[PDB]
Amino acid sequence: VWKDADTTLFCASDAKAYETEVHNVWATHACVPTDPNPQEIHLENVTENFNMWKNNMVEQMHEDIISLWDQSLQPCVKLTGGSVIKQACPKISFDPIPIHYCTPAGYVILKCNDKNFNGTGPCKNVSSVQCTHGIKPVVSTQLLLNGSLAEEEIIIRSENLTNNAKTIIVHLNKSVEINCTRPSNDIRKAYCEINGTKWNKVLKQVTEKLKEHFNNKTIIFQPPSGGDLEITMHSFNCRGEFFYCNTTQLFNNTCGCNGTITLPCKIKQIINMWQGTGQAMYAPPIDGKINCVSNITGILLTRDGGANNTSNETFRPGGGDMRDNWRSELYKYKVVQIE
Ligand SMILES: N=C(N)NCCN1CCN(C(=O)N2CCC[C@H](C(=O)Nc3ccc(Cl)c(F)c3)C2)CC1
Ligand SMILES: *[C@@H]1O[C@H](CO)[C@@H](O)[C@H](O)[C@H]1NC(C)=O
Numbered sequence: 660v661w662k663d664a665d666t667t668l669f670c671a672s673d674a675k676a677y678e679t680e681v682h683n684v685w686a687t688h689a690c691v692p693t694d695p696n697p698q699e700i701h702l703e704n705v706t707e708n709f710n711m712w713k714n715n716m717v718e719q720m721h722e723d724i725i726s727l728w729d730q731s732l733q734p735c736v737k738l739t740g741g742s743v744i745k746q747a748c749p750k751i752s753f754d755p756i757p758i759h760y761c762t763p764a765g766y767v768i769l770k771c772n773d774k775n776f777n778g779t780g781p782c783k784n785v786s787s788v789q790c791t792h793g794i795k796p797v798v799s800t801q802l803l804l805n806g807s808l809a810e811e812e813i814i815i816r817s818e819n820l821t822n823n824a825k826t827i828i829v830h831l832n833k834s835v836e837i838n839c840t841r842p843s844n845d846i847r848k849a850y851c852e853i854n855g856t857k858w859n860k861v862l863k864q865v866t867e868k869l870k871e872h873f874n875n876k877t878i879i880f881q882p883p884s885g886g887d888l889e890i891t892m893h894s895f896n897c898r899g900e901f902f903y904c905n906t907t908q909l910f911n912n913t914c915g916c917n918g919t920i921t922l923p924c925k926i927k928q929i930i931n932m933w934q935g936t937g938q939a940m941y942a943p944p945i946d947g948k949i950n951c952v953s954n955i956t957g958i959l960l961t962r963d964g965g966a967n968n969t970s971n972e973t974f975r976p977g978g979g980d981m982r983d984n985w986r987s988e989l990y991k992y993k994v995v996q997i998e
């Protein structure tokens with residue numbers, strides 16, 4: 660037996676206790692060693708309801724990544740509502756490692772193993788676990804990077820597809836490598852290379868899956884309509900530096916267009932922090948090639964409103980609520996208490 664319950668979990672990771680990498684250093688002193696002998700205990704013919712849009716686990720992962728970043732990625736200056744703070748900001752080594760979220764005795768995590776589970780609703784293949792899987796705290800917008808992939812057809816996750824204000828998460832079943840670089844020796848100019856032939860292939864598929872949820876209909880893509888730079892550009896952190904990338908060449912409906920699409924990017928110093936509060940200035944990029952090859956495994960979409968009288972739905976990349984970023988890997992988990 661069990662009851663829908665919330666508690667205070669602990670974390671686990673394979674952090675190498677010697678590395679200077681910020682994540683390892685933080686997980687070394689804030690997480691326990693990964694369970695060496697873990698086991699799924701299959702709850703046969705048990706059907707439990709899940710919900711990833713109202714999950715405390717997300718919030719508990721948020722507090723960690725807010726803490727980890729604030730312990731390691733310190734800005735030279737914090738313009739937090741006037742309270743401008745000058746402090747130290749040495750360049751560091753930044754590469755996320757997997758983190759596990761375990762329950763204390765008296766509770767357990769129920770993991771939905773349905774291959775087509777969309778995050779909400781009921782699950783029929785429930786199994787019980789003590790620690791989640793190695794989740795990578797990847798901070799990014801528009802595109803979800805370095806995550807897990809749907810084990811079947813493309814899944815469309817949303818707290819309510821009808822409400823257009825609720826964000827749409829797309830869990831791809833095939834990753835698309837995005838390769839970003841800042842050439843050695845303007846030091847903020849950079850670019851991301853994406854195979855245009857796989858992107859549109861996968862982009863086509865997303866449309867197909869999106870038509871199913873909107874009474875077939877016409878599904879068009881358009882760049883974001885206003886907002887802060889962090890959301891109009893595909894923002895992400897690579898080797899510690901903040902890359903801003905113009906995804907105008909990906910969210911056009913052009914598709915003689917299937918070569919290597921090169922995205923213009925800029926390493927930005929003034930960042931509109933994702934943890935909340937305000938702005939923060941960082942030091943200029945390190946010398947050398949700042950290269951990060953990453954898997955696109957999801958997309959942050961936001962549908963336009965008012966097309967109820969029209970015959971087409973417009974979709975624009977979203978982001979900025981990193982809670983929906985962890986939400987894309989914690990969807991299959993849920994904390995219940997052993998009553
Ligand atoms: N109840 C709560 N707990 N709310 C938490 C949400 N909190 C409040 C609102 N809130 C924002 O509304 N925004 C929107 C403006 C853009 C900002 C951004 O996302 N910056 C960014 C920087 C670097 C990278 Cl790599 C990146 F991907 C993104 C953040 C903050 C958190
Ligand atoms: C349920 O999930 C398990 C993994 O926990 C896997 O064998 C398969 O997807 C499902 N199996 C059964 C018997 O439902």
Ligand SMILES: *[C@@H]1O[C@H](CO)[C@@H](O)[C@H](O)[C@H]1NC(C)=O
Nearest residue numbers: 777779780781815816817820
């Ligand atoms: C997810 O699946 C459940 C199954 O009951 C359904 O109620 C819900 O509307 C689905 N949500 C989306 C976004 O498809």
Ligand SMILES: *[C@@H]1O[C@H](CO)[C@@H](O)[C@H](O)[C@H]1NC(C)=O
Nearest residue numbers: 805806808833834835953954
């Ligand atoms: C990227 O995706 C490939 C297959 O899609 C996978 O084998 C590889 O482990 C992924 N890399 C990362 C860093 O997740």
Ligand SMILES: *[C@@H]1O[C@H](CO)[C@@H](O)[C@H](O)[C@H]1NC(C)=O
Nearest residue numbers: 810811812813832833864868
């Ligand atoms: C991914 O899902 C789509 C349906 O959305 C399907 O057509 C395609 O074959 C799937 N690809 C893989 C590799 O599973």
Ligand SMILES: *[C@@H]1O[C@H](CO)[C@@H](O)[C@H](O)[C@H]1NC(C)=O
Nearest residue numbers: 818819820821822823824825
């Ligand atoms: C989904 O959003 C629509 C539009 O706001 C609303 O009418 C509907 O009640 C919502 N569904 C639920 C289950 O709240």
Ligand SMILES: *[C@@H]1O[C@H](CO)[C@@H](O)[C@H](O)[C@H]1NC(C)=O
Nearest residue numbers: 836838839840852950951952
């Ligand atoms: C990534 O791009 C750089 C610059 O174009 C190139 O030198 C490198 O070989 C690329 N790597 C991959 C895996 O595509």
Ligand SMILES: *[C@@H]1O[C@H](CO)[C@@H](O)[C@H](O)[C@H]1NC(C)=O
Nearest residue numbers: 854855856857858860918919
């Ligand atoms: C792009 O992807 C397609 C299909 O996956 C592949 O056939 C092609 O070789 C890729 N192009 C490059 C430059 O790697």
Ligand SMILES: *[C@@H]1O[C@H](CO)[C@@H](O)[C@H](O)[C@H]1NC(C)=O
Nearest residue numbers: 882888891892905906907908
């Ligand atoms: C991205 O590039 C396109 C075409 O060059 C441009 O119209 C758009 O303004 C750019 N995005 C931003 C956020 O400036």
Ligand SMILES: *[C@@H]1O[C@H](CO)[C@@H](O)[C@H](O)[C@H]1NC(C)=O
Nearest residue numbers: 755804805895896951952953
């Ligand atoms: C994704 O993973 C690869 C290899 O694991 C790494 O090189 C890259 O920096 C990661 N991307 C991000 C945004 O952390």
